[PDB]
Amino acid sequence: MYGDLGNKLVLEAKRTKQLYARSNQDVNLPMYHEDIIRNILKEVSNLRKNTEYLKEQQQLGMLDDKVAKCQYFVTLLCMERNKRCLLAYQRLRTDILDSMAWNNNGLDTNNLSHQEQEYLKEYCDLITDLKSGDLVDIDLSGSLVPPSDVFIDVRVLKDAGEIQTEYGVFNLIKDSQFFVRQSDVERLIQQGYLQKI
């Protein structure tokens, strides 16, 4: 019956919830089920046709006091359930896109629906609007691991040559090592040019 497509969408939601927490990295979230979602939206359209085809037949006289009191209500409950599965799936994928927008793009696009490619842009634009204002003195997209550490040894993990950064210049020669203040290199550590800590 009608909810059985929704359950397949939310079993894919659950598997992507597990996937994104089990695997230690930021994984690329799996491809949007445009097909299962079109099946669900098509079934909601047939439940709408059944509300239309009932709502007229009330005036034609077919014992609506019992008959419509149940048939409308069950047709409506099926559409509440399909709305919930779609919204529960779409909110989970939203939570992961916001996590990318803070964690990485704060400092795979084939997988996203076009509304999500759009939403991810508008949300990265919102993040940069918060840090570009008052509260600019603290880099909100910065690290949540506390600064227990003052100067650190860092080993340069990939060649990138002479690079600028706001605080200074480094020549990132493959397998040279720097002893430098943690606050200067922290974004290069996040980009994966540097190793240690």
Partner: peptide, 13 residues
Amino acid sequence: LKLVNDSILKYMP
């Protein structure tokens, strides 16, 4: 709201 409203709510009764 724009994301869900377009993407899935557009089709709801």
